[PDB]
């Protein structure tokens, strides 16, 4: 189906504790495959998927050089933003960037993005047209006009439509088998006490990958939307994910409820109940 190549960049100023920290993380689909961190010494662009080790010394050297080049640029950018916001040289500030392309099954661009934030808030973003900009405040407007005047959007459109898309093809080539991996959930229901004549049924899904999953509870064939409790899906720490969803039901009526688990990995959805 569709695919994406995205780079997540963070630059963080640290006045009096050292040089700004520059971090760059690349994702294919939603899987980290490269990373650069300016805080190692002899910082290097590094593979984060074994399948990227197919690339060879020239790739890695050129990406390292380019990342150190961005690091320098971002140092300047941070200083500029102090001016725009009349901010002192003593505080820590953050620039963040999300840059990338979504392509279809045919390999053609579906959408490109290049979004900036400052101190965690939208600053400037390239519009879907890949031609115009949305500035979030007055400071961003200064950047918008500088970027319009400099043809930055033309540059980005060319990168997004071509370069980015072509590199996505290449990486998919070496990672597609590993990327397609899927671990189905294993699920079970636990039983816990509530005050008076009520109990909690908790449906657990464990060991699954990728993270996208749905858990639902049904009374008799009919969904308990109004109020089931759940947790945000969370990493087990070993590459797989966890989720649960619970409902409070009458003591004695536990067998009136079923939990359903929906995941890509499953031949069909799981249906469970309390033992």
């Amino acid at each position: 189906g569709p695919h994406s190549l995205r780079y997540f960049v963070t630059a963080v100023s640290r006045p009096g504790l050292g040089e700004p920290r520059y971090m760059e993380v690349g994702y294919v689909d939603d899987t980290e495959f490269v990373r650069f961190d300016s805080d190692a010494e002899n910082p290097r662009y590094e593979p984060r998927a074994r399948w990227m080790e197919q690339e060879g010394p020239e790739y890695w050297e050129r990406e390292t050089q380019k990342a150190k080049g961005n690091e320098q640029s971002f140092r300047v950018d941070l200083r500029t933003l102090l001016g725009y916001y009349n901010q002192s040289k003593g505080g820590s500030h953050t620039i963040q960037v999300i840059s990338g392309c979504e392509v279809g099954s045919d390999g053609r661009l579906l959408r490109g993005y290049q979004q900036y934030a400052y101190d965690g808030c939208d600053y400037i973003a390239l519009n879907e047209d890949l031609k115009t900009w949305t500035a979030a405040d007055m400071a961003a407007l200064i950047t918008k006009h500088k970027w319009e005047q400099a043809g930055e959007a033309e540059r980005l459109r060319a990168y997004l439509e071509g370069t980015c898309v072509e590199w996505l093809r290449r990486y998919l080539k070496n990672g597609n088998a590993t990327l397609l991996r899927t671990d189905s959930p294993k699920a079970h229901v636990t039983h816990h006490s509530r005050p008076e004549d009520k109990v909690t049924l908790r449906c657990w899904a464990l060991g699954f990958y990728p993270a996208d999953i749905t858990l639902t509870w049904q009374l008799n064939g009919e969904e308990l939307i109004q109020d089931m409790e759940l947790v945000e899906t969370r990493p087990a720490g070993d590459g797989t994910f966890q989720k649960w969803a619970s409902v409070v039901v009458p003591l004695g009526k536990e067998q009136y409820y079923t939990c359903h688990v929906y995941h890509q990995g499953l031949p069909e959805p799981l249906t469970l109940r309390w033992e």
Binding site: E24, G26, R62, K66, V76, S99, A150, R155, T163
Partner: peptide
């Protein structure tokens, strides 16, 4: 391979 912005903020 990531884009390298050649103009400042």
């Amino acid at each position: 391979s990531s884009y390298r912005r050649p103009v400042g903020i």
